[PDB]
Design a protein around this nucleic acid. Structure first.
Length: 165
RNA sequence: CUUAAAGAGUCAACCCUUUGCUUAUCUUCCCUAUUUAAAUGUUAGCAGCCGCAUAGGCUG
């Protein structure tokens, strides 16, 4: 499965992962991740990294994504399309923290507010200690941190370049 | 082989009565605080439905 490389140039001004977040945000709103384009990072050590690799099955040409990342050309480097027999695709994992589940339980189970806090008083508090990425959102108006972990491959992809199920 | 050797000090108590420390005053005069820088560690780890699950998935 052929892949192309996107390299974030080293900048003391902006964050290296912060450019990556704006790269991933601009790759979302300008299409790209329709149903087949996936993103892997060769440098999972503690952070996301700096080099971006897109391994779409039909192939990503250089012309389409040099105009997609037109706002990022100050500190980006777009490589040539190479080939790879296997990529390390990742998946999205969410963190649940108290009121994420409190307002869900009163909607479905029909319990009271004090009843819902009683069942979840001595539970929850999930905090992932794994690499994350601060990509925000445009449908719902807030910013958040998205966690990605290494697991098995999947055929289909979502609109974030990650695998589904 | 210790001036070794050894021995009950017990007892009871009214201190107490009185007083003028008073008066007096110039602390004052002077002051260069100063200068200068990244909030970073990616920051916030969110908003809901798919489900019996506070198991596991999706959505941006």
């Amino acid at each position: 499965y052929n892949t192309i490389s996107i390299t974030v140039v080293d900048a003391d001004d902006v964050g290296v992962n912060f450019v990556v977040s704006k790269v991933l945000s601009t790759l979302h709103n300008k299409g790209i991740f329709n149903g087949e384009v996936g993103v892997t990072f060769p440098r999972m050590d503690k952070n996301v990294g700096d080099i971006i690799t897109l391994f779409s099955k039909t192939g990503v040409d250089r012309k389409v994504l040099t105009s997609t990342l037109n706002t990022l050309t100050d500190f980006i480097h777009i490589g040539k399309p190479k080939e790879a027999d296997k990529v390390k695709t990742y998946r999205k994992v969410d963190t649940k923290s108290k009121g994420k589940l409190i307002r869900r339980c009163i909607k479905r189970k029909g319990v009271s507010a004090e009843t819902a806090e009683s069942l979840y008083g001595n539970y929850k508090g999930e905090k992932c200690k794994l690499p994350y990425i601060v990509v925000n959102s445009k449908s719902t108006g807030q910013r958040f941190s998205m966690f990605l972990e290494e697991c098995e491959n999947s055929e289909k992809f979502n609109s974030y370049g990650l695998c589904i199920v």
